[PDB]
Amino acid sequence: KMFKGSIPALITPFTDNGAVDEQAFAAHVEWQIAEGSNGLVPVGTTGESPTLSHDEHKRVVELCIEVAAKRVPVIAGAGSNNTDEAIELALHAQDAGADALLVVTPYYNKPTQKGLFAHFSAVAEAVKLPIVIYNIPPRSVVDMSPETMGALVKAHKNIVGVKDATGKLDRVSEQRISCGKDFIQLSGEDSTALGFNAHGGVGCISVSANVAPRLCSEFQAAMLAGDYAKALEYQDRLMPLHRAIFMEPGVCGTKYALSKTRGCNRKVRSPLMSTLEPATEAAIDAALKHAGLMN
Amino acid sequence: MFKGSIPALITPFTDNGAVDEQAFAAHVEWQIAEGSNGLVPVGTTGESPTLSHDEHKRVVELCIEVAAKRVPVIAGAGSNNTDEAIELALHAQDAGADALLVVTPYYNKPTQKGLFAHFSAVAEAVKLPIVIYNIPPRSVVDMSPETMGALVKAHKNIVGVKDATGKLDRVSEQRISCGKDFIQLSGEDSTALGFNAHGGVGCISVSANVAPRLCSEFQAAMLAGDYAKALEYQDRLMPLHRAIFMEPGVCGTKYALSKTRGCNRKVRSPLMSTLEPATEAAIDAALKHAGLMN
Amino acid sequence: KMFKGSIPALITPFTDNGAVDEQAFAAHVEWQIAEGSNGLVPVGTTGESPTLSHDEHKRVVELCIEVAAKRVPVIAGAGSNNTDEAIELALHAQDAGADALLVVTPYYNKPTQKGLFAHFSAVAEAVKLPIVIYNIPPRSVVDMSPETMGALVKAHKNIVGVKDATGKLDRVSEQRISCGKDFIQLSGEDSTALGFNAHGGVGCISVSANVAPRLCSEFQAAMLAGDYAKALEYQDRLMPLHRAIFMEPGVCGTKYALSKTRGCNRKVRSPLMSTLEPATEAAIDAALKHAGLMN
Amino acid sequence: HHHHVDDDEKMFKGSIPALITPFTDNGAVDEQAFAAHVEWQIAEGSNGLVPVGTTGESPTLSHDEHKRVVELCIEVAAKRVPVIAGAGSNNTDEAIELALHAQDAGADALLVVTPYYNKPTQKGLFAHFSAVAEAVKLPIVIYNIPPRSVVDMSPETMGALVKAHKNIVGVKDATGKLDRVSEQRISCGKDFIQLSGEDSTALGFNAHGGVGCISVSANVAPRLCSEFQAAMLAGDYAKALEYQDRLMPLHRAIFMEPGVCGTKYALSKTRGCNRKVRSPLMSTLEPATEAAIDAALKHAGLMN
């Protein structure tokens, strides 16, 4: 009920000097809801969580909750490779009034499966909010196995879902076995959200939704209805965009696309770049025209 | 023509390692009876690497004879040697095959231009439809959608792909580069479900050797657009898909068939006629789950 | 002269409660110097930088400098995937009196090569200290190319070296071409420190040196002397240890080994675990006996 | 003079070219060019010869051609250096046939690749190499190359083979993981013959205990490669690094595209050799690749 459909991994707009642009962020969230987004993820990876201060992280979560006004669930990014920091970020989001938590697998320090279990257990015990595990080997290197995931689901009632960015669709099937058919599985990959739902997924936490919220929402709606022929038609319309925004970092592809369609600021924080290669920008332009978002 | 559940047929051997022609014929006949929509003789799962040229030719001919035009025969004609690939392609054409399955050259690691040259040479040599068999997990090299698109434009008889990348976004990229009419068949049993959601129209399948009826019904559900039913089949078949591939698929399959149909487990070295106890236990459990064993 | 030989990537010992054990750290550093270590890296990955607060990071750097007493160079860990944070950490270490900085490639957020250039350029311009680039694709996923590295070396006089944890020894040869023969190359992999120096390396920033500082120092001394036959004898003695301490995370393998030889506390911070598998502990035990560090 | 080793037993070391197989314009084996290449390799200081390995285009040769080139190599070598015949296949029966032919023809050893494409288990690898080793009396060098075969023979499997078969004597190790040399010393012994299967890391490979390299670059620069290996045998690693400085651009350039094609281009420039290869390899290269090879040849002193 809460975790379904098209859920944007919201960008964090900045002003020219790199400061958080609260006006632009609020306007983006308002527009997302109006266009049919089924949920919101503030201050995740695509919201540039790595370069935000604790105060900025807190404020954007609070602002997202305020703008949403209980219309759609707010699933706050509360990730860290430091368990104590993850708990600290999780507790704030609970106090601020978030509906759920998105918790990434620890990156860089490369814990064991038992370390992953201990990390997520400690977060789950510290809060009452529902938790969605964010398994992303392409970023974190480590990979939570279906066995570890199943163990966490059994041990903690508030571990309710996964944002699965493995890109291995057989993992959805394996997770159905280890975690149950009721376990909430959301795609962490825009380009395979289609196949992901065919395997049992019920939505996607999406980067592309930042650019094309209506099309992404209708795409997800088609799959919920069991209309996969229509879903494939949406894939035909959207795939060039999915591909183009990820030629370089998704944050930067997304902010470029929105700079063209909506006059959004391209500013990001280092080590991300406010610029893109010409072939990337050309592909994004062509993809926007193909999707009907530009002329 | 080329659609649905298409078994990547095993080649049964007798105890001494010789091709068991009668066991092969019975296997093909049963496959057709159970609803398989096409046949791939002497591909990877048919142990093409360990068959002689004479054996390869004989098994292709037998498959054609047993099929009796009921379902298409898509003959394995792969090699990392272009000249050899052409020879196998020409034989299969002369024997009366309906199409050719042509693997990307393995081991020698050609460039994209080398892949283009290889497939162009095969396509120019025969009139039969060709299905490109792109399998980076075995061949290392990976035919890009751009190279694939160039081949499709250049040769009218390059009609499809058996896509074993396991990257479902590649189906979408191949729709763009090769067209929506390009025939895409899954080369991975466990993701055949998502593959068809992305535009695929079937699967060249190892699991179909063991469960041809369930695999055919699974594919039929997807053709009908009934993806809820397809997922129910996935629930039933996934343990088998996983278990068959814990060790090499040929060996997992021949073990499963030894339990259900009294098939010989014999394979040719470097494949092994044996499996680990845990693999056999997992296959046993999967067969029970699928309703193929009590 | 500064950066050479056996340079331990120092562990940060904790008490049972998880607080920094300053006394144990001081004793560890003093022993390292006594046993022949040629330099020191405090608060790097193996020092559990991800789970240390800014204050703790600061204190341990300051502590390392004081105990060292200018006997060997202190190369302070100052890594982050946030450029602003990397600068802050680098500035403190400089203020504290560090001799150099070890700066990791940004992890998790996956910048482009141009993003890597921007990140390291920003750190280099902010400080006067020499900087060693820490290129570790197994942790950061991104991989600084020899071309990007060479561009940084040309642009900034204070970018002087690399801790190369690629495990691809041909990269040393490529880095000699792009960065010059005088560019300081230090192995980031204990098990291939031998081949690394044969290719032109001049030392190793080492996890194993925490456990066997004398053997590691003598090993490096043999290679400086050009005595590769002797260096291979040390490899025979040390390889089982190199392998065993990395069966599970190196921090945890190292702290177990030190618990056996020196009575070190095994405590680490989550998501790292204070425990190991029985097979790992048995392998470390066997390796210590083989090395002559236990009976 | 002849090769003798004062263990009359059984010596494979130094710079050992993975010999190309020259073709005429029509793609037929050029026996004249092959013989001339072998003769020149020996004259320039190569310490052994591998005919019809991967770089000799074994995948595109017929059985007859494979046999002929092996025999020709043995004939031309005339016992001056060891001939380690390529006898690889992913079909065990075929590997045995090739092994037996090489023995009867007078080869000194076999180079036997891990089965590619069919992806056997570790136990399958053991069975494959055991069957080959039991069939012949020749020394066998295991060719472990995960970048081509995908499968990777573990040090444990390798050690088990060494224990089971006295004629399994060495490895051509193309893992590119130098810690594997150290692990193979543990599992197979310090006397196990380890030869680098990667030109660019032959330097570090010997530092870890290797005693030579089965080499693509040696086709182009046999004298420099032999002197490079001699420096390492003498323990002169500073000199070896000077050779690496001289040769690394060539190691890199010839592998920008397939090594067979990089090598045949280089030899077309230095010695007028034919660039012809058999499909799916291409007789052509990208302009930037050729330019890089040209620059590398000049740097090495092989072209003006």
Tell if the CB–CB gap between D240 and C198 is shorter than 8 Å. yes
For chain A, the maximum distance between any two Cα atoms, rounded to a whole number of angstroms, is 52
- Helix-, strand-, coil-residue percentages of chain C, each rounded to 5: 50, 15, 35
Interatomic CA distance for residues D54 and D174, integer angstroms: 12
Interatomic CA distance for residues D224 and D199, integer angstroms: 13
CA A241 to chain centre: 17
Secondary structure string (H, E, C) spanning B193-256: HHHHHCCCCEEEECHHHCCHHHHHHHHHHHHCCCHHHHHHHHHHHHHHHHHHCCCCHHHHHHHH
DSSP, collapsed to helix, strand or coil, labels residue A204 as strand
- Chain B and chain D share a number of CB contacts under 8 A equal to 112
Strand partners, B161: B132, B184
In residues, how long is chain D? 304
DSSP, collapsed to helix, strand or coil, labels residue D50 as strand
Tell if the CB–CB gap between C273 and A84 is shorter than 8 Å. no
Structure tokens at B125: 């040599």
Find the DSSP H helices in A36-53: none
User: Phi then psi for D170, rounded to 5 degrees?
Assistant: -165, 180
- Helix-, strand-, coil-residue percentages of chain A, each rounded to 5: 50, 15, 35
Look-up of token digits 């792969």: B78
Nearest to A229 by CA among B180, B1, B35: B180
Look-up of token digits 């607060």: C53
Interatomic CA distance for residues B55 and D85, integer angstroms: 28
Structure tokens at D189: 């012994």
Return the residue in D237, D251, D252, D299 with the most chain C beta carbons within 10 A, the one to mutate for interface testing. Answer: D237
Instruction: Give strand ranges (E) for A30-79.
Output: 75-77
Structure tokens at C93: 């270490």
B113-117 CB contacts, 8 Å cutoff, 24+ apart:
B113/D282, B114/D258, B114/D279, B114/D280, B114/D281, B114/D282, B115/B141, B115/B143, B115/B147, B115/D280, B116/B147, B116/B150, B116/B151, B117/B82, B117/D279, B117/D280, B117/D282
Tell if the CB–CB gap between A273 and C114 is shorter than 8 Å. yes
Interatomic CA distance for residues A70 and A33, integer angstroms: 11
Task: Write the DSSP assignment of chain B as a string of letters.
Answer: ---EEEEB----B-TTS-B-HHHHHHHHHHHHHHT---BB-SSGGGTGGGS-HHHHHHHHHHHHHHHTTSS-BEEE---SSHHHHHHHHHHHHHHT-SEEEEEPPPSS---HHHHHHHHHHHHHH--S-EEEEE-HHHHS----HHHHHHHHHH-TTEEEEEE-S--THHHHHHHHHH-TTSEEEES-GGGHHHHHHTT--EEEESGGGT-HHHHHHHHHHHHTT-HHHHHHHHHHHHHHHHHHTSS-HHHHHHHHHHHHS-------TTS-S---HHHHHHHHHHHHHTTS--
**Chain B residues closer than 8 Å to A243 by CB:** 169, 173
Interatomic CA distance for residues B44 and D216, integer angstroms: 31
Q: Which of D147, D258, D280 sits opposite B82 (nearest CB)?
A: D280
Task: Write the DSSP assignment of C10-74 as a string of letters.
Answer: ----B-TTS-B-HHHHHHHHHHHHHHT---BB-SSTTTTGGG--HHHHHHHHHHHHHHHTTSS-B
Task: State the sign of the Cα–Cα–Cα–Cα dihedral A200, A204, A208, A214.
Answer: positive
Interatomic CA distance for residues D259 and D217, integer angstroms: 9
- Chain A and chain B share a number of CB contacts under 8 A equal to 90
Q: Which of B190, B196, B226 sits opposite A170 (nearest CB)?
A: B190
- D274 secondary structure, DSSP code: -
Q: Closest approach of chain A CAs to the CA of C119, in angstroms? A: 5
Class of domain D1-304: alpha beta
Contacts of C286 (CB under 8 A, 6+ apart): C240, C244
Look-up of token digits 């990730």: A79
Nearest to C166 by CA among C194, C138, C145, C191: C138
Separation in Å, CA B56 to CA A47, B62, B205: 57, 10, 19
**Chain B residues closer than 8 Å to D55 by CB:** none
What is the CB neighbour count within 10 angstroms for residue A155?
13
Interatomic CA distance for residues D173 and D175, integer angstroms: 6
- Whether the Cβ atoms of residue A137 and residue A143 lie closer than 8 Å to each other: yes
Return the residue in C11, C17, C45, C51 with the most chain A beta carbons within 10 A, the one to mutate for interface testing. Answer: C51
What is the rounded (10 degree) CA torsion for B240, B245, B248, B250? 30
* Helical packing angle, C228-244 and C250-261, nearest 10°: 100
Among chain C, residues having any CB pair with chain A shorter than 8 Å are 45, 48, 50-51, 81-84, 106-112, 114-116, 118-119, 122, 138-141, 248-249, 269-273, 275
In residues, how long is chain A? 295
Q: Say whether domain B1-294 belongs to CATH 3.40.449.10.
A: no
Strand partners, C75: C100
DSSP, collapsed to helix, strand or coil, labels residue D23 as strand
- Rg of chain C taking only CA atoms, in angstroms: 18
Tell if the CB–CB gap between C197 and D186 is shorter than 8 Å. no
What is the CB neighbour count within 10 angstroms for residue D166?
10
Give the neighbours of chain D: at least 3 Cβ pairs within 8 Å. Answer: B, C
Nearest to C207 by CA among C247, C246, C163: C246
Tell if the CB–CB gap between D179 and C229 is shorter than 8 Å. no
Strand partners, A102: A77, A132
Nearest to D229 by CA among D28, D73, D47: D47
Q: How determined?
A: X-ray
Nearest to A266 by CA among A7, A21, A88, A98: A21
Reply yes or no on whether D172 is catalytic: yes
- Whether the Cβ atoms of residue A241 and residue A290 lie closer than 8 Å to each other: yes
Task: Say if residue A217 is exposed, middle or buried (CB neighbours under 10 Å; 0-12, 13-18, 19+).
Answer: buried
Interatomic CA distance for residues A251 and A268, integer angstroms: 8
Secondary structure string (H, E, C) spanning D76-120: HHCCCCCEEEECCCCCHHHHHHHHHHHHHHCCCEEEEECCCCCCC
Q: Closest approach of chain D CAs to the CA of C244, in angstroms? A: 12
Interatomic CA distance for residues D69 and D65, integer angstroms: 6
- A209 secondary structure, DSSP code: G
CA B269 to chain centre: 21
Reply yes or no on whether D143 is catalytic: yes
DSSP, collapsed to helix, strand or coil, labels residue C2 as coil
Interatomic CA distance for residues C171 and C148, integer angstroms: 13
Distance linking the first and last C-alpha atoms of chain D? 34
Interatomic CA distance for residues A143 and A111, integer angstroms: 10
Tell if the CB–CB gap between D182 and C239 is shorter than 8 Å. yes
**Chain D residues closer than 8 Å to C207 by CB:** none
Sheet with D168-173, strands from edge to edge, namely D14-17, D212-215, D193-196, D168-173, D140-144, D109-113, D84-86
Interatomic CA distance for residues A132 and A119, integer angstroms: 13
Q: Where are the domains of chain A?
A: 1-295
* Helical packing angle, D179-188 and C228-244, nearest 10°: 90
Return the residue in B146, B167, B168 with the most chain A beta carbons within 10 A, the one to mutate for interface testing. Answer: B168
- A82 secondary structure, DSSP code: S
Resolution in angstroms for this experimental structure?
Answer: 1.5
Contacts of C245 (CB under 8 A, 6+ apart): C207, C208, C211, C253, C254, C257, C284, C287
Interatomic CA distance for residues A185 and A135, integer angstroms: 11
Q: Say whether domain C1-295 belongs to CATH 3.40.50.720.
A: no
